[PDB]
Every structure is written in C-alpha cells, then in structure tokens.
Ligand binder design. Sequence first.
Ligand SMILES: *Cc1c(COP(=O)(O)O)cnc(C)c1O
Ligand SMILES: *Cc1c(COP(=O)(O)O)cnc(C)c1O
Lengths: 394, 392
Amino acid sequence: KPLSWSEAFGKGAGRIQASTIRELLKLTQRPGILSFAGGLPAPELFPKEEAAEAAARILREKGEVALQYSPTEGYAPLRAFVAEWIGVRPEEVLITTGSQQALDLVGKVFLDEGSPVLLEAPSYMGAIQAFRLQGPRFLTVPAGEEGPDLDALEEVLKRERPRFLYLIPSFQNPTGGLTPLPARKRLLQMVMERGLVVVEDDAYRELYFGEARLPSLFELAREAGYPGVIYLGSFSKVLSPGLRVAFAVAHPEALQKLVQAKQGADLHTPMLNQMLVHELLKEGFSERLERVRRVYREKAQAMLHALDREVPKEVRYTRPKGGMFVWMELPKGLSAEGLFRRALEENVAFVPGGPFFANGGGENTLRLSYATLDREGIAEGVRRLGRALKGLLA
Amino acid sequence: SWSEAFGKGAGRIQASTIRELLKLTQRPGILSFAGGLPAPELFPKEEAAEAAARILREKGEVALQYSPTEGYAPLRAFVAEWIGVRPEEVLITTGSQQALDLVGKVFLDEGSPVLLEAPSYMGAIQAFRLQGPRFLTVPAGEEGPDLDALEEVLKRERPRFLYLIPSFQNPTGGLTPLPARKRLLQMVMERGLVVVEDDAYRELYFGEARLPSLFELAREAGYPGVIYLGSFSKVLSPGLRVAFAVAHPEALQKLVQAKQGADLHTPMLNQMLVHELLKEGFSERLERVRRVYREKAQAMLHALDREVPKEVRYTRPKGGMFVWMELPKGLSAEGLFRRALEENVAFVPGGPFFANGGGENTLRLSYATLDREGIAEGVRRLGRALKGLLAL
Ligand SMILES: *Cc1c(COP(=O)(O)O)cnc(C)c1O
Ligand SMILES: *Cc1c(COP(=O)(O)O)cnc(C)c1O
C-alpha cells in the first residue's frame, strides 16, 4: 500500500516540527522592514580580505590536508590555540561544527526519553531544539537580569536530579542577563553539592561592554578541582557564524563520549574552516576582540537611548551589559503575537518570547536584537516599534 | 560520577576499531590498506585556492554570514541538474555522514527495526546504532544483497527503512545488477517501505556506464519511498564535508528540521567553493577519477593474484575503492592483523562492518591512497603475512 510519511517517521520526527518560529521569522524580512528578530552577528566585522588571503595560502600550500579526511577531535593547531586561550590542555578540546552541534552531541550522550534536563526560562532556541530531540522532561527556573533564580533552583534540585544544567552565564540569550560573580559561586556550590553536570554556553564570552569579563563556571569550577562543567565556546560571534567552527571543553571521560558522538554526526568539522579560523586568530586576536566590543557596545547604547524616548515606561526592557539582546516585557495580559502583527504594519519586527520557553510561556515578552542594524536603523526601528507598541496599549 | 551520569545513547557509541586501533597503522614505515581515504592526487589544489580566495573577496558577506539550512541555491540547482531532479528536492548536508544521522533521528526509535546488509558501511551502523534500533541484516555478495534472505525477512519483519549501497558497496565492492534492483524495488513498493540509497560511489565505475539508481527506477515507477544520498567526498574533496540528500518533499522537511538542530546549516563557504569548482568541466574531472581508481584497482588485483594464496579469497570490484578479503572460516583476520604488522602492512578487520557481530575471518582493503609501488609492495607484505597464517 501507499506511503504515509506522517507515520513512516519515528517519535523524534515529532519533537522537531519548528513550524511557527519559521512562518513568523519569514513574515519579516520583506520590503522596507527594519527587523530586530534573528541573531545575525554584525556583518561589517567579517574579515573578508584576509580570509580570502588565508584561504588561498592554505589551500595552495596545504591543500592535501584541508581537502582530505581529517581527525575527529579537530585540527591540531586550532585545538592548541583554543587550549592556550581558554586555559587547558589540547586533549580537553573538541572542535565542533558550531556550538549547535556540541549542543546536539551533549543531548545525545546525556539525555534519554523522559530524562530530567535543567535550563532557564526563557533560553536559547538552539539548546531547546537540540535537547527536545531527545524527548526529555524540561525542568526550569526563571531568569532575570541577575542570571537564574538560584533559590527556585535549589528547590528544583532537591526534588529532582537533572542529567545536567544548561546555563548561559554571560549575556544569556534571549534576556541578555548577566550572572554576578557571587551568584556564580553559589551556583557552583549547589552543583558540587550534588555532583551535577553543568553545560556552560559562553558564546558571548568576549562581548562584555564592561572593563572586563567575569570568570566562568568552568574557570571557577576548575580552580576548585571539580570537573563536572562542560564549556562550549564558539567563533560565530567574534569571527564568522557562517564558518561553522566551535568547540567543547570538558573532562576526558565526557570528552571521549562527545568525540564518538561527533564522529557519527559528521565524521569531522571541515578542515579548511578549522585552519582558516586559526590563520586569523593567531594574528591580532586581541585587537579583533577589542574591535568587536566597541561595535556592539555602540549599537547597544543606541538601542537603549531610542527605547527610552519612544517606549512608554508601562513596559520594561533590560539594559544589556554585553551581547546583542534586549529582552522586552509588555504589561501582563498583553500578547506579543498581537504586538508582532501590529509591528509589521509599522514595518518593524522582533521575535515573540514564546519560542524561548522550553515548556511554553512568555506570552507577553519578546526579544530584540540590535547587532545587524545601523545607529539609524536602530533608532528608526525603535520609533516604529514604540509606535506600534503604543497602538497595542488600549 | 561520569559513567553514572550519561545516557543510553552513550553506550550505543563506544568507538572501538576507529579511534583506538588506527594508531598502530601509522608508525614509522608501514604501508596501510586500512582507512577509506580518497586519492589526494585528485584534489584541485590551485583551482580551489583561486575560487575560495575569490568567494571571500567578492561575496564574502554571504559566505561568512549564517545561511538558511537547505543550502546555497546554486549548489542545489547544480545537484538537481546532475541527479535529474528539482532544486526543492535537494537537501545539502555536511557530508553523507550527516544525512545518515538525520535519517536515523527521523525514522528510528529504540527498538525500531532497521534493515541493512551484513556487512555494510560502518558509518551507517554508527549513525543508526545511536538510536538503539534492532538490526536486521541480510548477507551481501558480489551481486549485492541476498534478495531471497530479504523477502524472507520482509515476510516477518517490517524495517523502518532499508539501507543499501547498490553501487560498489563499502566494504565489499559488490555491484547490484539492474535486474536485482528491479526486484528489490518491486519488494519495497509492494510493502510501502523506505529505502535509504547511499551513492557515494555513483561516479566511480570502472566500466563505461553507471547503473540505474534505485532512486531512478523508483521515481520512474512513481514510488516516493527512496531517500537518495549523494556525496562530494569521493569526486572532489572528502574534507570539505559537502554532500546532499534527495528525497520526497514531506520527508525532506523533517530532514531539514532535523539538520538545523544538528549544525544550523552546512558551512556556506564550503558549499559555494564546491559549486565554483564544479560549474566547470565536471565530466572531465569525473573521468580523471574513474581512471585513477580503475588504474589503481587493476594494480591491486594483479598484486593480489601474484601474492595471495589460493586458500584465501578476495572480491574483484567493478568500481569503488575497496577489496574485501575473507580467510577460510575459523582463521582470524584480527590475528592476521598482528602478523601483518610484523610485515609492516595493515588493513581493517571486518568485525565492525557487521551490525550484529560475526565475520571475524574477513577484512577490508583500501588502495586509493597508495600508488603503483605501494600497492605492489604492500600486497607483497600482505601476501607474506598470509603465508604465515596459512603456516598453521
Ligand atoms: C549565537 C549563539 C551560539 C553560536 O552558535 P553556533 O552554532 O556556534 O554558531 C551559541 N549559543 C548561544 C546562546 C548563542 O546565542
Ligand atoms: C565515503 C562514503 C560516504 C561519504 O561520506 P561523507 O560524509 O560524504 O564523507 C557515504 N557512504 C559510503 C558507503 C562511503 O564509503
């Protein structure tokens, strides 16, 4: 008899529909529409010219390596560089095809159908999507400008032992929250206090607007002796998101598992991409970082000064200290889906908060990104938003 | 703490003969017949350095910026043109290795029955195993999968899908003749079954004509149950990790949705580079490889007919890049692996190629990396180690 795909599929097929966060992210990007949706890094920072140069030099001088199957752990020097950067040995670094893959790997080796997974609400759609594929039970705690609610977390931890906690300490997506050094130390003790695994996504490590970067769960934990933290770093927010080159740092025991999972995922991360990324960070990484901080800091200050003028104070909006997000909250009882369609009529866009909630929620919240627009688009965008934002209040 | 923290999937991934025993086949001076690496001589060094340098310069903003999962439109159209289908039916992945990971994730649940030959591509076993399926294997030979043993399985079991490599299967090199394909398709259409067709070796036939693909016989028949997998790893570069999946629209979406959770999208730099290199004289490039493997394969068999004892058999591949050897039952290929080192030569023991164990008296031989002398020299050392084993 005929083929009914809908039933030919397995269970996982239904745990990744992703059909509403696609139709809604599509309605935008039309004619003259300024958008604050999507997390596309600032394009002007892409190092074209020297990427072109490094790529040719690489393919021409070592083409029989960049084009040949390569080790799964990753390109040797790249690993050395990441180790020397983070502060660990090469054998503790696994190059991945973006943090998105590492997330997927993490889920494959840690989650089982029904398993307990702890993360924040809201959180990164990437982790949610990847994890959801393993049909776990999502345990959550709300997150605010001071990071995750550590108390709420204590009562959830005493009631159940989650396979691991997925945190985003530095400038969490989508709130843009920052977890203070104190909270981080408390959160570390709660973890060592129960031998729990912590997955630290530090994609925005270097996007701190302040005069310095607060240490990480990985650092704090490593300088204690505890190896239950898995550090996930990426180059998608400092170099290029398209190259798809990231890494995962962890204790050998777990590392081993990720490597074998990785292998079955795509054999290995493209070699060119790995060598390319290296040939750009071995030269002036410090000033490159320095150069990116200023760019986002600038767009941030601009995003805020415009929000303060056009946005009535009946609605709250975070004040980002790093990263590329502004988490907005409409008064209770009001919807973002409504604000969204009101906004499109004013030719502006954002992402309703809903999809950032593992178990659903944030019906009155929404995320705003300011990393892809101009100090004029930013401003022109906020004018329109707050305009529609004003048309919804009634 | 750690082991008491993982999950079922962590046990279905123990990478043994892949990232453990492959370090011994590396030392000082030992010719290796292990590992299926494509010939490096075919790699377009200068043409790629030019295309790449130009992509980063002229259109580097789309090359380095996040891209919609599916893939560089021009590459999908090119692939669509090549395979004989449309751009919307094509999905670009990070190597076929991924498509096998995306299929496992979409059709398999713990317990799910999957059918694939025994032996078959380790990559596929690995990709699937992670799901906890139940493997139904059918013996594979010079003519392909044992269709009788197969119909005898379709009469009891109903696999979520059948995984087959009709053209120069890894590791045997067997080639399924058109009639056998016609039969096989007749069997899955009669039962509305899914078939994942892996054509990594589509273009590597030493003859002068490629055989109709299961995707081709099917599309022509009207049946949409085939998911055609294709790669660029054996005809351009394996390290670029650029491949594709051609399937029915409704099955493609789920694969697309699965891919985003995997790596978001395939590096766009790589996709554009591949397209840049193939919009020009593809046919000639294909003939150059067809020649090199044909050329290396003839040298491989010759060295074998001149060195291997008669009490041991090996396949005579009509395409591909492998030669599958089988010692007389009872004799270990893993033991041989020890007398092979004494002789400074190596190969891949067959065990890992059997989804459900067994066949420990067989092993795979790859030659694509060696050249005329390595072939002859290695087959001479392998031929010697064999005499040792046949020396009781
Ligand atoms: C942008 C982002 C990443 C980067 O993902 P990649 O797959 O490495 O490109 C990872 N985590 C978070 C929270 C992000 O916002
Ligand atoms: C080489 C090969 C592939 C190609 O895998 P990639 O991920 O594209 O490098 C797929 N299937 C088989 C049987 C192969 O031998």
